[PDB]
Design a protein around this ligand. Sequence first.
Ligand SMILES: CCc1ccc(NS(=O)(=O)c2ccc(F)cc2)c(C(=O)O)c1C
Ligand SMILES: [Mn+2]
Ligand SMILES: [Mn+2]
Length: 369
Amino acid sequence: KVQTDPPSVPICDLYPNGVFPKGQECEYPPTQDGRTAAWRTTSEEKKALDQASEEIWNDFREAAEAHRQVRKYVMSWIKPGMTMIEICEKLEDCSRKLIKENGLNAGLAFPTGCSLNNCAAHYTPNAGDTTVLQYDDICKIDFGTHISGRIIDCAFTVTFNPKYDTLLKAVKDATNTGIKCAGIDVRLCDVGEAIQEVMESYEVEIDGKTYQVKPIRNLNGHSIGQYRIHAGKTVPIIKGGEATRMEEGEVYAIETFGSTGKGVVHDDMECSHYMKNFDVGHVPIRLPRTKHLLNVINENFGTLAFCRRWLDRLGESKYLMALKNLCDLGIVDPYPPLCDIKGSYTAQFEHTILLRPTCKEVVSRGDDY
Ligand SMILES: CCc1ccc(NS(=O)(=O)c2ccc(F)cc2)c(C(=O)O)c1C
Ligand SMILES: [Mn+2]
Ligand SMILES: [Mn+2]
């Protein structure tokens, strides 16, 4: 009925009523004519529309509470000296128990990202990686939980040297600025500019050098779909703006990345992230190993991202060639680590928000961030 010191009680059994805690509920940002959004807070039409998709919002909440309790636990023990593998496996072991992993009904939405320093995202260790977290490392812990495909994409940055404090704040503030600015009928490009003005209004000093924080321009937030980490709409972070507005009922992952490098990422290091193309249909495979591996992917991950380690834990061996095949066949897409120029530092803060009819909910919000 109460969580245990080292979290072990599933969020499930903590809220027996089946109703999970809501995130930070915000009133939608006004528009031109000071168009207030307090009319939706209790409109009759909207309230019916909201309570209409209540079971969904409730699932996002179960996952969010899982994310909150897991990360609270990670910040209490993540320390330099631990290998990236020890960290990810310890984090993922907790994440599996609190979300009560159940096939594709409940589990980890994507691999535990823990990109270091100049690398901003999509780095998680593969078997054999001997990398050890250092006192001067700036590590982005980015992991996700999901219930019935309702994905909670949320992340924070970890450091131990106070010299990055102002860099993390610059980015944490940039993220909240995009969260506050986001809303139904809000144009993506606008959320982007907002995020940039703030991000760039910060200047930091790290090891004698001064820098004006730069948003990683080729990185960004994005909309979320059931069992689909990236639904289709992207959230800028800079000045351009695709050509779109956020819509009622949508779900977005508002994330920003700040850097001292060139503010641009590129594929680097060995790949560990892979995900089945949400669009590709059923492809008959006769090649044994490739056929088997794909079956494992469909059974265990569906359209959710996974990593080599997760193939390992399932007892799969000698699967790289077969994984390459799936990749060359375009059935699976590789998602290599995205890093900025060597020597640069990058920070990241991310939250999942629900654009509900009556309000904007920052479901993954917590005491920490
Ligand atoms: C590796 C699976 C994956 C695919 C697409 C996106 N979304 S994205 O393409 O908008 C993206 C890519 C890199 C990044 F750093 C942020 C967002 C993400 C993600 O939300 O990070 C993941 C984990
Ligand atoms: Mn993320
Ligand atoms: Mn994301």
